[PDB]
Design a binder for this molecule. Structure first.
Ligand SMILES: *NC(=O)CSP(=O)(O)OP(=O)(O)OP(=O)(O)OC[C@H]1O[C@@H](n2cnc3c(N)ncnc32)[C@H](O)[C@@H]1O
Ligand SMILES: *NC(=O)CSP(=O)(O)OP(=O)(O)OP(=O)(O)OC[C@H]1O[C@@H](n2cnc3c(N)ncnc32)[C@H](O)[C@@H]1O
Ligand SMILES: [Mn+2]
Ligand SMILES: [Mn+2]
Lengths: 13, 297, 83, 83, 297, 14
């Protein structure tokens, strides 16, 4: 149910 | 600790919704608010299998809410730390999150309540209420970092308030927060400088605010629909931004434009946003807003 | 012998003005600092300083029993004056 | 990045030994200092420094959110290193 | 306010003795010590006509006792600050102060109990007990500034403990305390450097300790009898010091001599004093002393 | 009753 897809594992470009 | 509450004064009624690493329940709380026998509340918890990094975040949200007192910020009611599981008691937002509520209004929505989409007026109210809540946050020297419709909550009377302080950070020392390592970030809501340098400010929150407005006028449509995270990163970092949704009031279109200025110093402040809408708001606004408060000196 | 009597203490200087003061000189005046009364938390003080050209603000518990802390800041100020 | 990684932090150095360290050099090493873990209050740290040849001990609230404080001490240490 | 106690849990029985600006009562305290229904205690108070300076001192004693936990230091039990009069609850020293006790032993004493003067052995016990209490104090980085027989208390079992922390000061930062302005000082017990420069250290406390020993071996005779304060001031500042009382054991005479070295760094430390007496002490000593404690690292 | 006489109002000498 939680919008886990709204987050992306990342670091600044 | 002055916030500690006996686990006996708490009673879970039902489950409201699943969180990324915990479950949110509705329940009752006996004498949590002087003057009230029992108060219906929301109760956040952490799953046993939750990692320490998630436990710390969970404890962070509680921690920061302790210092807040704003009508447009979900309020902290109490905590139960004595013996697990740990419980964070906060005010119950009767109509859940704004995103979910906005989608209910889609005509095709299977859970469509019984009314049409928000009115220009209703939207302005939401916008001012959200901006007011953020202004308080900024005034207290905190950057939200995750402003989005899913994190905006709707009260029984439809008043919108800012919630979910997991990513919130204290920026009293520098006015900004810089994340260097990897981490889960809400990219579709992030400003260019944040995606590029990992720097968050009241200004990057303002960018997110513009996105929320878009969410509102599009009935929680998925931002940058089509593009993949990586594509969004590049698109935004290169000067791109969302299109105006269908029939979007141009007044709102103006705000979004101010919110998406490439240069963070070109974007407006939350106080400015409220100031721009102060006239066309519900009569009670001045009695509850941070804006019209004595605190706003 | 009192907070008010030290050169590094600047009473009600605004945080905004304080940052300006320690940054005028860019990374060259790295280390420069001032102590002021907090704008937000009343009664408390704040240490505003220049770190590699960037302004930083540190909340302190200051303003009796604070004499030795005053000595600490005086000594730092002493090293500064020698630049 | 972390307290342990700074040259001015000396972990479990005794208060007695810390005073000796900052006083070896008398009033000449005025300003020299070190940060250590408190011997009495556990979890807390102490700033031991030389003021005009006399040793002083300042109790601190240290050891997340302490990064800027770390910067502050590094900058003072930086001024020191230049003597 | 972790030490606060409901004024209702307190009941005054009788008056134990008058203090310079307050009254000390004996009383009962309900649930002040977990595991005990009611505990017999001593209760310190302040006269309404007491000056601010005296109120601060009164509050200072309470404040510093909060951090102490030593068998040879009168223990703080609780405080009642909510609404006046303010109450400081501490352990009951059944046999009152040492000075008064020592005078009872004078053969001529109208209130002579039923025993002879203390024995060499009994004196060494008192000395080590007092020295142990002071060592703890020093270890905690506090200088008493007013060590004297009137401020030493005697338990129901005759164990002597350090009391009255009105003039006590935290010296964690410099290892010394310097008083510059005027004030009421216990001159007859003060070291030379304290009379001259107003500087107090564990070394000046040691000088006072020597004076207590003299008090003990002279059965609380008034020190520097004859001389007036100003004379005492000069006398001591110029290298003078008390004479050995009658029949004073030489071993004790040695301690006094070490306590009255003119140069503070020539005097012994409280730990050293205990170390010098550790062997000839009651078997229980090692079980209670700070000296034989794990804390003494 | 209290040994008020054991104290003297004063300031350090020199
Ligand atoms: N980036 C993100 O913010 C995560 S996506 P999300 O849908 O906002 O969920 P998440 O933050 O992971 O969920 P959360 O733990 O906040 O909660 C699960 C559901 O519980 C409801 N909720 C939370 N606090 C509430 C209060 N005070 N009153 C009513 N309902 C509450 C939300 O509907 C959330 O979806
Ligand atoms: N320089 C000074 O210390 C002041 S002269 P003093 O004769 O020591 O008295 P003062 O400090 O003014 O008196 P205090 O209030 O300390 O106490 C008065 C009498 O009460 C008895 N007392 C005090 N604490 C006690 C405890 N914990 N248990 C039993 N009895 C206690 C003493 O008899 C003291 O003389
Ligand atoms: Mn969320
Ligand atoms: Mn006394």
């Amino acid at each position: 149910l939680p919008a886990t897809g709204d987050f992306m594992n990342m670091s600044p470009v | 600790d002055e916030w500690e509450v006996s686990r006996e004064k708490i009673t879970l009624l039902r489950e409201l919704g699943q969180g990324s690493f915990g479950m949110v329940y509705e329940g009752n709380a006996r004498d949590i608010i002087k003057g009230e026998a029992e108060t219906r509340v929301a109760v956040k918890t952490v799953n046993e299998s939750a990692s320490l990094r998630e436990r710390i975040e969970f404890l962070n949200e509680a921690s920061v809410m302790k210092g807040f007192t704003c009508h447009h910020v979900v309020r902290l009611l109490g905590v139960v730390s004595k013996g697990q599981p740990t419980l964070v008691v906060m005010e119950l937002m009767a109509h859940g999150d704004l995103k979910s509520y906005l989608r209910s209004l889609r005509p095709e929505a299977e859970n469509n309540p019984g009314r049409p989409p928000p009115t220009l007026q209703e939207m302005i109210q939401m916008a001012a209420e959200i901006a007011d809540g953020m202004a308080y946050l900024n005034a207290k020297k905190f950057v939200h970092r995750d402003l989005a419709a899913r994190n905006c909550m709707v009260a029984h009377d439809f008043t919108v308030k800012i919630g979910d302080f997991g990513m919130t950070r204290d920026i009293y020392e520098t006015d900004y927060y810089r994340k260097g390592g990897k981490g889960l970030l809400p990219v579709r809501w992030m400003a260019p400088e944040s995606l590029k340098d990992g720097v968050f400010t009241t200004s990057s929150d303002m960018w997110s605010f513009g996105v929320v407005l878009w969410e509102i006028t599009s009935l929680a449509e998925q931002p940058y629909q089509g593009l993949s995270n990586e594509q969004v990163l590049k698109f935004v970092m290169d000067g791109g931004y969302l299109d105006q949704p269908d029939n979007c009031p141009e007044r709102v279109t103006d705000l979004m434009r101010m919110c998406w200025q490439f240069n963070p110093n070109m974007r407006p402040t939350f106080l400015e946003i409220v100031n721009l809408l102060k006239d066309d708001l519900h009569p009670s606004f001045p009695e509850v807003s941070f804006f019209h408060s004595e605190e706003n000196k | 012998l009192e907070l008010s009597d030290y050169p590094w203490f600047h009473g009600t200087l605004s945080r905004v003005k304080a940052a300006q003061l320690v940054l005028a000189g860019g990374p060259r005046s790295h280390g420069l600092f001032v102590i002021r009364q907090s704008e937000t938390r009343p009664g408390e003080c704040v240490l505003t300083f220049n770190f590699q050209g960037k302004a930083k603000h540190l909340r302190l518990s200051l303003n009796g029993q604070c004499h030795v802390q005053h000595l600490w800041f005086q000594s730092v100020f002493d090293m500064l004056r020698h630049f």
